[PDB]
Amino acid sequence: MKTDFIMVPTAMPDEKMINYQLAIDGGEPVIPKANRKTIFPNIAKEDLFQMMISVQKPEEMVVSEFAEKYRQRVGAPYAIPTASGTSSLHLALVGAGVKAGDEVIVPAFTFIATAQAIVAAKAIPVFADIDPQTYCLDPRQLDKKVTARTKAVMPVHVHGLPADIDALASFCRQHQLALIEDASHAHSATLHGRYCGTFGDAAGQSLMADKNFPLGGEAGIAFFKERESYDRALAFLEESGLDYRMSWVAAAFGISQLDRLDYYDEIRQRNAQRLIDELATTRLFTGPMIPAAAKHSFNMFRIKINTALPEFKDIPEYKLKLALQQILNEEGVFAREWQNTLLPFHLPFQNKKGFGKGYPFFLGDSQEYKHEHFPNALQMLRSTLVLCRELRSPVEYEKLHSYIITFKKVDKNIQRVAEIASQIDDVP
Amino acid sequence: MKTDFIMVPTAMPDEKMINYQLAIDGGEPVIPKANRKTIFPNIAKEDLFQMMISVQKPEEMVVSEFAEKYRQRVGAPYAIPTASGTSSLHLALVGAGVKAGDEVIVPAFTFIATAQAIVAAKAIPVFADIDPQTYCLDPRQLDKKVTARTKAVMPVHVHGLPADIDALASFCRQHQLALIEDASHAHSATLHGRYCGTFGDAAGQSLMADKNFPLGGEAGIAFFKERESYDRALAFLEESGLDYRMSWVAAAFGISQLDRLDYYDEIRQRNAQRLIDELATTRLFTGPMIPAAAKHSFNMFRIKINTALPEFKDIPEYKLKLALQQILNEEGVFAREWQNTLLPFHLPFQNKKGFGKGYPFFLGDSQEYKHEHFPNALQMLRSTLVLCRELRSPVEYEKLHSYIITFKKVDKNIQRVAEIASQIDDVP
Amino acid sequence: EQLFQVSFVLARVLTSGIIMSIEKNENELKGLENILKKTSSKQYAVTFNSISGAVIGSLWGQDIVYGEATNQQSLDEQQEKLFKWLGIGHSSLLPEPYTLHAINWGNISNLQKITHEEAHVTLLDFTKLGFGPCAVLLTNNETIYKKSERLKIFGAFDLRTMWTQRETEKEIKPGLQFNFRLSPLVGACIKMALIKMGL
Amino acid sequence: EQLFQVSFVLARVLTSGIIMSIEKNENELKGLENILKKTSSKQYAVTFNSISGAVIGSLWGQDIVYGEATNQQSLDEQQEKLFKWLGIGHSSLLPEPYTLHAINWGNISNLQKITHEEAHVTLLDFTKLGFGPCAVLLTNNETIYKKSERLKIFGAFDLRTKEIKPGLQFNFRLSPLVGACIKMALIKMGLN
Ligand SMILES: Cc1ncc(COP(=O)(O)O)c(CN[C@@H](CCC(=O)O)C(=O)O)c1O
Ligand SMILES: Cc1ncc(COP(=O)(O)O)c(CN[C@@H](CCC(=O)O)C(=O)O)c1O
Fold first, then answer.
1. Out of C6, C82, C179, whose CB is closest to B55?
2. CB of A50 closer than 6 A to ligand 1?
3. What is the DSSP letter of C183?
4. What is the DSSP code (8-state) at residue D41?
């Protein structure tokens, strides 16, 4: 049979490997090549059996069963299950009262789908810079972006860290704006013990198979605070003629996965917290900042490089990033970038075609976006590393400690990092 | 959904718990109540899918597929799949040429099935003492046990440790005796790099769901060195009218499990080896001895209590055993006896009913055994404890380390062990 | 239809993780017994992983052991061999030891009529259902029940003793024993087959 | 053995672990497309997780965008509503933008006769097979193909690494598990 089962267990890494030669310079890697696969999602016998249960029921029952079960967990008053996160964000925006020609303030750093949902709602994305520590929509930059045309603010709980709901909701009440969460990374993430997705007037959430809480392929869910918004969303589906329905196959995988989510979440939480604590003792690395009130879901784990170390004098930050990416990858830790370009500079928001002929961008005053407008976002991109599947997967202790050894090993070789970074060619 | 899925992960135990109060005296246990379940077998998605493959095939083809596949791994030239390990040993004995009235030399310490297979073959078990370190059939005896009626010697690879094949085979050649292995715990156990079950003229092996390599319920397999012995076993089945056939359902589970055996085996080997090393540092406990040529399967992990420590002066060994059993159980380590009585003193070999009217026992001598004859086996029973499920399951590091801390905790409280042991009431 | 139902049961039991005959909370075999007791109106049931086991249980349960005789008029070639292996002779003047019914997919539905009979020992063979060798002994005779369980290694009384720490049957002495314990997975498949076919 | 066949495929794909549309080594969607390309005589196929996706692809692929018009004389209420949402008017002077076939268990076996037309764009709606919303666009027009893929976030263009410009985009990516069921149905019902 074709299976993804990993036949080689991760051996406990020797702590002496902190003292080893770097793998980029012909040394032994911390993680052997045979131990570099991580399986995700965690597909268990329960998931297979669940399919045999759900296949016997009407497809609509399976979908509504899932929607109801997950809604009760999240604690949202109302929920609509959808075919995708993107569509759930569309319905969230419309339900909350976003209309054609309205402006929606959204972070410049997020996945394209966040902004494409705004355009689908026939609204104009107004891109804003992010906080340099949380990486979420900066609330301090909302007064600059608000116009008479603004109707909503759309924070993204990016990486799995809650955005600053307290400050954003305060701003929204003052300016009579709707608040729409994108909780696509923030499954099980909490602020003041309440789940992301219940704070805004509405919220969308990807339930794709690459998320901490995965459904069986493509899926999403929209949450609504008030019945009014839920009704308006359903009304829109009736009037628009869009079919945004979830598959029972996807839903069924969700039903079984949801029974084990708390277990997997606990492993994720302990693992990521240990890594943070360990990275804190290094000179070179710092794990993601987490406010006291927040619980991070750790869909992605973003590490700050200390580019201001004296060894790195006169070395561009982006070279340090590239060098560390190469070095870490050779050790077996796949530190890649999640999002290389800010959304204003993706083709759809350069050409601004939309539905065709510039609709709905031409409903409001245009904006020439420049790199100077997003310093914090750009600073992040050139001074940070991201682990995705490493810590999304609830890995075993041996693997977690392998990560720890890797970062500590590299931290012992800061001088050598500087030399490698120096010799990287200029990239215009 | 009815599932055995454990919802609470094992947390890393605090090293300070070595200093904690014993759980039997109201202290916090090393292993919380919620972390005491152990999954076995390791049932995965592959196993469920394998059933859906095998259900479409003729049942006899599935059984044959399994037998063939497992035979090639083991490297036995011929194999017969059976309903049970007990039946496999019966066919192994008959195939190797054991006849009605013959005597078979067998350890007094093994599971009832071993001797009960002998009686099935219409032979008389001749019980012998064990080596005090390997716990296997003692080769130093035998001379005093051999008789004109003696036809075979039946070593058990008990716990998963290989018996002294070199010594026993040498004895078998001198006296023209057959060698029949009971390899029912010795899945993947090797001596000189060769799997248990290839050494004897024949061999039986349990494939029950509680063995390191589990089939889907009750199952077994007999191995034969020569075609003569294989044919004789097949002939006996035809002549006897016994239906000892394997279920395809049990076989199917075997087919899938066999693809993952090496992985689970590796974890077992490392876990067991670490615990041996850790127990070596302790004053009170010692892990199982392993000859240099042998590789233990670690189906069971028998631990030697040092009952000769000064604190235990004038305390019967069985009280030390019972006390440590209670003490460990309260910490969350389910140390227990596997056998309490040697086979000679089980009811079947006291009444000697057999097939009825004392057949086949009345063919041989009186065969009256006393405890004086088995000093090593009785000493073992008085001064050891066994882990079964704990280390049969390929447990995660957190669980392994919980075991280590438990033993180190108890080891730091030897004086309390003595006090508790002394308070236990007298028994036979 | 059939392949799905078999797959479902196996998936269900595998998911539960309870696949050992000797496990606590194993309830598949108990369920199989109950249905067959209900259908037959017999007080006692004993499951086996082989027809041979049910035969031996029926014989030894009536003290038809080595050196004894019974009526072998109705035996096929296989059982005739088994009786010989056990050392049991033939006499036309003696009663038959049991009534045996081979159950298959042809007659599964008519199990009510088959098993509701005057026979004091009924042996049902389920091997031809194609889930693996399986047989069930049904009787009102408590002594046949007890001895049939006793001849199984880790039978009912060994299980009771290994959980309560007290001999559940001292008077019922074991001699030779076998592993005729049935796989829960096999029993579950047979239980489902019964439920889906009327009985 | 419908319940078994569906269960087996789901079990097969779950066992492989390849349940993401965007994963490398995802073969179910290609297999589905290849079958439908053979059954029809069409060079290009695009898979969607909604009939809405196939409709928009056909329209935008022929530059029928906001402000434009086409022939809506054969649309049901739902698609009329979608066209209106896209900002597309009506004219009987123009040809129809596509030909739509709803595939169900009743007519799945006769897909070869259904997909052999003189249609510029063939939309196959598989939603009523009961595996989830699913539609496939079939065409010989490469521009329709390319624009239909570009319209999808993480479409063909995004996966395999300033040509065909994306505007508004949607997640119309189909779940492999759903695709695998439809593929199996097509094979089982005699479409090679
Ligand atoms: C922040 C954000 N918003 C919206 C969406 C849209 O959800 P869909 O279900 O795809 O429609 C995504 C998905 N983008 C990536 C995120 C993956 C990850 O970070 O693990 C994706 O789905 O591949 C997202 O990351
Ligand atoms: C020494 C020995 N020989 C043969 C057998 C085969 O008997 P079957 O049950 O017919 O396969 C067993 C299994 N006896 C125990 C072993 C328990 C264990 O070590 O995990 C049992 O299967 O419960 C055994 O322990």
1. C6
2. no
3. P
4. T
Q: Which chain D residues are closer than 8 Å to C3 by Cβ?
A: 1, 4
In this structure, what are the phi and psi dihedrals at residue B269, rounded to the nearest 5 degrees? -65, -45
For residues B205 and B221, the answer to whether their CB atoms sit within 8 Å is: yes
In 3-state terms chain C splits into helix, strand, coil percentages (rounded to 5) of 45, 15, 40
* Resolution, expressed in angstroms to one decimal: 2.3
- What experimental approach yielded this model? X-ray
Cβ contact C176–B354 (<8 Å)? yes
CA distances from B167 to A81, A321, B173, C125 (A): 70, 64, 10, 46
Q: How far apart are CA B270 and CA C181, in angstroms?
A: 34
Ligand 2 proximity of B299 Cβ (cutoff 6 Å): yes
Domains of chain A: 45-255 (3.40.640.10)
The pair phi, psi for residue B126, each rounded to 5°, is: -115, 105
Residue A371 tokens, joined: 């790199």
* Closest CA to ligand 2's atom 23: B210
Identify all chain B residues contacting C85, using CB atoms and an 8 Å cutoff. Answer: 239-242
| H helix or E strand, kind and range, residue B279 | helix B261-281
Structure tokens at A229: 């918004």
Q: In what order do the strands lie in the sheet with B178-182?
A: B78-82, B220-224, B202-206, B178-182, B150-153, B103-107, B124-128
Find which of C4, C6, C10, C15 to mutate to test the A interface (most A CBs within 10 Å of its CB): C15
In whole angstroms, give the CA distance from residue A30 to residue A271. Answer: 18
Residue C121 and residue C137 in contact, taking contact as beta carbons nearer than 8 Å: yes
Residue C122, amino acid? T
Rounded Cα distance, A268 and A274, in Å: 10
Cβ of residue A116 lying under 6 Å from some atom of ligand 1 = no
Closest C-alpha among B380, B404, B400 to residue B390: B400
Distances (CA, A) of D190 to D115, D122, D123, D125, D186: 15, 20, 20, 18, 7
Q: Does C89 touch chain B (CB under 8 A)?
A: no
Domains of chain D: 29-174 (3.40.640.10)
Nearest-neighbour CA in chain D from B48: distance (Å): 8
- The structure tokens 């044919």 sit at B231
- For residues A301 and A288, the answer to whether their CB atoms sit within 8 Å is yes
Closest-CA distance of chain A to residue D97, Å: 17
The H or E element spanning position A398 is helix A397-411
> Is the CB–ligand 1 distance for residue A83 below 6 Å?
no
DSSP string spanning B324-345? HHHHHHHHT---B-S-SS-GGG
> In sequence order, what DSSP letters do the residues of A207-223 get, joined into one string?
--TTSSS--SSS-EEEE
Strands (E) in A8-161, as ranges, are 78-82, 103-107, 124-128, 150-153
Question: Which residues, numbered 3 to 62 in chain C, qualify as contacts with chain B under a Cβ-Cβ cut-off of 8 Å?
Answer: 3, 6-7, 10-12, 14-22, 49-52, 60
Q: How far is the CA of A113 from the centre of ligand 1 (A)?
A: 7
**Which residues pair with residue A356 across a beta bridge?**
A359
Task: Annotate B23-58 with DSSP letters as a single string.
Answer: GGGTPPPSS-GGG-----S---HHHHHHHHHHTTS-
For residue A376, the SS3 value is: helix
Rounded-to-integer distance, Cα C180 and Cα C79, Å? 16
Of A45, A256, A259, the CB nearest to B44: A45
The alpha helices in D49-155, defined as continuous H runs, are: 51-61, 77-86, 111-114, 142-150
Tell me the C-alpha to C-alpha distance, in Å, between residue D43 and each of D33, D103, D121.
Answer: 10, 20, 11
Find which of A2, A243, A350, A392 to mutate to test the D interface (most D CBs within 10 Å of its CB): A243
Element (H, E) at D135: strand D135-139
Place of tokens 């434009």: D68
